[PDB]
Amino acid sequence: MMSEIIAVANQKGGVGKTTTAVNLAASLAVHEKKILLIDFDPQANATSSLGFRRDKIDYDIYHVLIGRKQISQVILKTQMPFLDLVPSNLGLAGFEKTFYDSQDENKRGELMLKNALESVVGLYDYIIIDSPPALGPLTINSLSAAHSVIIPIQCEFFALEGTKLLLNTIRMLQKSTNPKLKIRGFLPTMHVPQLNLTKGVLAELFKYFDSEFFRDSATGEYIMIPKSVKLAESPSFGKPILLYDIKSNGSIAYQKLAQSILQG
Amino acid sequence: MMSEIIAVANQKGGVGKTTTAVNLAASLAVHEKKILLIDFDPQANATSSLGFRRDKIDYDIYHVLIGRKQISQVILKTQMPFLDLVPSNLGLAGFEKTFYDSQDENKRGELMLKNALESVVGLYDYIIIDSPPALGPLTINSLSAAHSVIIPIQCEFFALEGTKLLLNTIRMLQKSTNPKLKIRGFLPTMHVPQLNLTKGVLAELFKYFDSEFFRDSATGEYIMIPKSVKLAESPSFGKPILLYDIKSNGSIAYQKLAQSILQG
Amino acid sequence: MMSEIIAVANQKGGVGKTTTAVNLAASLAVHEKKILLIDFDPQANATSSLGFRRDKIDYDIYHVLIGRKQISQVILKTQMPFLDLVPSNLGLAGFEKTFYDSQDENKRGELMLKNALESVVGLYDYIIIDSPPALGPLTINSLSAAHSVIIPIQCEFFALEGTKLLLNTIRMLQKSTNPKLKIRGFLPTMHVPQLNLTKGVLAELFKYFDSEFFRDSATGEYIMIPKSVKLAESPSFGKPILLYDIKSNGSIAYQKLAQSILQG
Amino acid sequence: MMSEIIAVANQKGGVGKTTTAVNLAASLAVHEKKILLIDFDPQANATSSLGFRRDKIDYDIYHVLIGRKQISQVILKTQMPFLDLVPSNLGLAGFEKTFYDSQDENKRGELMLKNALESVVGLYDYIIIDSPPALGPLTINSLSAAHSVIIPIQCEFFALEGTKLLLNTIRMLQKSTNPKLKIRGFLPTMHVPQLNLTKGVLAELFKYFDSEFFRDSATGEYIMIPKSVKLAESPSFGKPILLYDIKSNGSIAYQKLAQSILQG
DNA sequence: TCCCTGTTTCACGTGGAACACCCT
DNA sequence: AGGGTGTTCCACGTGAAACAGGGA
Ligand SMILES: Nc1ncnc2c1ncn2[C@@H]1O[C@H](COP(=O)(O)OP(=O)(O)O)[C@@H](O)[C@H]1O
Ligand SMILES: Nc1ncnc2c1ncn2[C@@H]1O[C@H](COP(=O)(O)OP(=O)(O)O)[C@@H](O)[C@H]1O
Ligand SMILES: Nc1ncnc2c1ncn2[C@@H]1O[C@H](COP(=O)(O)OP(=O)(O)O)[C@@H](O)[C@H]1O
Ligand SMILES: Nc1ncnc2c1ncn2[C@@H]1O[C@H](COP(=O)(O)OP(=O)(O)O)[C@@H](O)[C@H]1O
Ligand SMILES: [Mg+2]
Ligand SMILES: [Mg+2]
Ligand SMILES: [Mg+2]
Ligand SMILES: [Mg+2]
């Protein structure tokens, strides 16, 4: 039993991290794999998108990072039996201060998530972490605990530099804390293929990263999440799109992403 | 005179903060008012949108907040003679550590931007600050230095929640540090009027906030930024839309926002 | 009393003449007024629509107009007690030859329906005549026997012309044979309001004829027959829509037409 | 050089005869065959559908049937070089009277169109005649002039009866005037395949006529003209949909009909 | 070089209709 | 059988964007 830990990360906000994390988790569960999703963002969209309103949540991931609880007590089960969730809440916005308090004394604070996870890394196939928007303490925790990193990219101008900064952050940690950190793939999100800016931004990214881009093993096609109002309406129903609408282009793209992850 | 300081702020990223700040700054410069735009985001998309490479940038606003420099030495003149810029760079990601130490030291980190701002408030008509996506120390400094706040809102499922969060921080600061802090307007961005999700999100926001939504004085119409790829392409040219294409509906909408701000 | 005689007439076929004639007859019969529907079409769709098999057809209207019989021996009772029928037959196609023999002679042939009708005009409240698709001798007899005229209109490219053609005939007969003949209304059929061609034809008709269009007295709304597959399947059951499905939109529209006529 | 004469005929109005005659003519001309289309309806919708309004026409088919002129002087050229038209006008409504005068004397009146046509039967590949709505003298001349007959069928209840009647008219003329008359095919028009009324009427027709229904040369699939608002807008442009939009489903169906006619 | 036009393609909202469950 | 639902499926209208060319 070993779980692969995959962080979905991008300092930039609004690029599809939470949409990807939730729907990739559900898409991997349908292939009868056991999935643990970790909302690592204080606003807690992944939690809300699975129907847990964060008025209702009592104990957070934050409580676990404090040692105030063990991760086994915070886990919640979802409408899908093979998808459980460690929820979030705005209390985790305290973690930033704790991080620096850690830096004050201890050479410790980068691995508060890795240590919180050790309890369960052997009871799931995949642990998917939904990261917040920055290269701050929460995202560094996220990347320091992960085997693999999924980078969802919206194909507009700021994605260019945005990636650069992100990758340098990974490679410093590849020499730092987490030498095993791997990029599992780039994933274009909200993808509108006919727009000129999209064609140019993807061309410029391909020039350096074509190797990194997610592909369909059967056909070798790129896998990209189309822009689809169905995927934006999904959180309004507390469900991932494969329960909410299984043949939408958005849902099909996320299930192809699951299979490609499933090759290796 | 005395500058009015407007923060462009929102709990979420990717909702058009940087787009609104840049294009509002430029649209007020056309009516020949003198404007300073402050990139207050470590990713620094505002800087990048006005054509400044971030490597070419030497000493940033971070230095100014740290006292290594004073705000007058970092200002740069732009392709618009009536629009200057305080550039940013990821070095400003250091500020949050400073922030917590400052609050540890003497409850001091929330007005370090306001103090850095005293040097120049009487040399501009408008100072526009573009803040990062969270309610973190940088955004807190932005809202604590400002007289008024523009909230750009993308009309998707979490907009209600996110704004509630932002408004509850604004209300803590009006009772704390900046009591005259005012809401200058909500501004719907990337607005696609035909989508059901858009109409539903706008109906729910109107029920609580119609009063705050920017309106064109002439006709009483709402001001909404249309979805317009020209606006996403403009920063790859280092220009604001009125220089890249002044007849775009995105450019027309931002000139209507500029005029509405100028009426009072 | 005197029965009011309404011709359902229009230069072109397939615009709904038979459907409105039949269902208007039934919808007025529900208000317990006694009505005779006169199939004046050799194809005899009204006959078949009330369940009469044309094997059972033995003595037609054609027999009556030649004097072979009087209108009272051809009438038949229908499943509605307040609705009887003069059936038709392809034998009625013989009448046009008779017509020209007639006009060769004595200006005789335009009123042969009117004369065959006065044997019974004091035994019904309404006489509804279902005319054939042209401005030929049968339709000429129909419009020459009638007090009022219903014009069903399918809203496609040639409707304008058709009505103009029909109108010119009506109005030559108003100075010729039947001077009190009046237009009781235009009635849009098979109406699907979303089509651009529907909108364009209705605008073109409104500009010349708005006054003539049937209206619901209660609200002043136009009465238009919706396109409704139920109304096309009803005659396969030998029924009018009010017996085949009373809550269909077709039946509701025809009952509002009935009510509007009952007002005068 | 022998021209094949094809009548487009059906007693019922509004079933697509003129739409079929026009678009079949145009679809055959594009296959480099020379086509003469004959408007045999006094309302003259085929003529107007090719852009010649009926105010503008000088001498019509009627003048020719009376012998007042010869068919070569009434012909008109179309926007397509391989399709000419003998136009119509409401003067042809006089022909019914002419027919019966003929009947008094000579057993002739059934072939006055056949007589008018011999003058040109050797200068066209196909002569397509667009018939009026009844089994009156005009349709009789049409079927007595033809080698073959195309029967367009709208699949509603009245197509059952109507069909039987038309065939008897043909079988009687196959014993009367035109012994080589053949039906080249049934053609379902305005076809909406999912409607239950459609499935049932086609089933009842297939039971007697499956062999007669038009089929695709290549696959043996039925050829049916889909219900398409583009085909109803087509006369609004004075053009057949082959020029007005050659990729609409209506246009594709008619060009498949042309190819199938062209196999034999 | 600018900028006018028309045409094509695409996602989304809309509503009539067949249908598989539903109640009972 | 009767009287909901809600679900899928289709054609059509709409509006943003790309584009081809047309234009002195
Ligand atoms: N493929 C897509 N098409 C349309 N909208 C999307 C898509 N993916 C995400 N969204 C919407 O975009 C917004 C940002 O997505 P989210 O996953 O919350 O990004 P992040 O977690 O990176 O901040 C949300 O409104 C979300 O529902
Ligand atoms: N009205 C608009 N239409 C189309 N794209 C837009 C619009 N406004 C912003 N964008 C694009 O959306 C992306 C995210 O917006 P940005 O302004 O950087 O917001 P934030 O500062 O909140 O992350 C950028 O690629 C930007 O060019
Ligand atoms: N409102 C309607 N919706 C759907 N089908 C209709 C409607 N009105 C008529 N029909 C059908 O259209 C066909 C033509 O109508 P019909 O009443 O026979 O026309 P006409 O008598 O003018 O030739 C018939 O099959 C009829 O069932
Ligand atoms: N396949 C089709 N889809 C939609 N409308 C059609 C179609 N065929 C014909 N129409 C329209 O139906 C009406 C009747 O067609 P038409 O060819 O005039 O029949 P007819 O010649 O038998 O009287 C016209 O408005 C016509 O444009
Ligand atoms: Mg998120
Ligand atoms: Mg920004
Ligand atoms: Mg009829
Ligand atoms: Mg016709």
CSV table of N, CA and C in Angstrom, one decimal, chain C residues 4-5 13 37 52 80 87 92 105 118 139 141 157 194 198 218 229 232 256:
chain,number,residue,atom,x,y,z
C,4,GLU,N,-75.4,32.3,-38.1
C,4,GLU,CA,-74.4,33.1,-38.7
C,4,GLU,C,-73.5,32.2,-39.5
C,5,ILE,N,-73.2,32.5,-40.8
C,5,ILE,CA,-72.4,31.7,-41.7
C,5,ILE,C,-71.0,32.2,-41.8
C,13,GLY,N,-53.3,26.1,-49.7
C,13,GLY,CA,-53.6,24.9,-48.9
C,13,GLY,C,-52.5,24.6,-47.9
C,37,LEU,N,-71.1,21.9,-39.6
C,37,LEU,CA,-69.9,22.0,-40.4
C,37,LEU,C,-70.2,21.4,-41.8
C,52,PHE,N,-65.9,10.0,-40.2
C,52,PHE,CA,-66.7,9.4,-41.3
C,52,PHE,C,-65.8,8.8,-42.4
C,80,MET,N,-70.4,14.8,-31.3
C,80,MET,CA,-70.9,15.9,-30.5
C,80,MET,C,-72.3,16.2,-30.8
C,87,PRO,N,-71.2,16.0,-45.1
C,87,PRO,CA,-70.0,15.3,-45.5
C,87,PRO,C,-69.8,15.7,-47.0
C,92,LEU,N,-67.7,15.7,-55.4
C,92,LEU,CA,-67.9,17.2,-55.4
C,92,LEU,C,-66.9,17.9,-56.4
C,105,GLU,N,-74.7,30.6,-68.5
C,105,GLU,CA,-76.1,30.7,-68.7
C,105,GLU,C,-76.8,32.0,-68.2
C,118,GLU,N,-80.4,28.0,-47.6
C,118,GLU,CA,-81.4,28.6,-46.8
C,118,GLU,C,-82.5,27.6,-46.3
C,139,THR,N,-64.8,27.7,-53.6
C,139,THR,CA,-64.5,28.7,-52.6
C,139,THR,C,-65.4,30.0,-52.9
C,141,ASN,N,-68.5,30.0,-54.1
C,141,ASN,CA,-69.8,29.7,-53.5
C,141,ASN,C,-69.7,29.9,-52.0
C,157,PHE,N,-43.3,32.8,-46.3
C,157,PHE,CA,-43.0,33.9,-47.2
C,157,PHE,C,-44.2,34.3,-48.1
C,194,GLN,N,-40.6,31.9,-32.2
C,194,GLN,CA,-39.2,32.1,-32.2
C,194,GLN,C,-38.5,32.3,-33.5
C,198,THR,N,-41.1,33.9,-39.1
C,198,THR,CA,-42.4,34.1,-38.4
C,198,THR,C,-42.5,35.5,-38.0
C,218,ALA,N,-60.6,39.5,-23.1
C,218,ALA,CA,-60.1,39.6,-21.7
C,218,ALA,C,-58.8,40.5,-21.6
C,229,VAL,N,-48.3,19.1,-32.4
C,229,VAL,CA,-48.5,17.8,-33.0
C,229,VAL,C,-49.8,17.1,-32.5
C,232,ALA,N,-52.5,17.7,-35.1
C,232,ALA,CA,-52.4,16.9,-36.3
C,232,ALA,C,-52.7,15.4,-36.0
C,256,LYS,N,-60.3,29.8,-27.1
C,256,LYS,CA,-60.3,31.2,-27.0
C,256,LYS,C,-60.8,31.9,-28.3
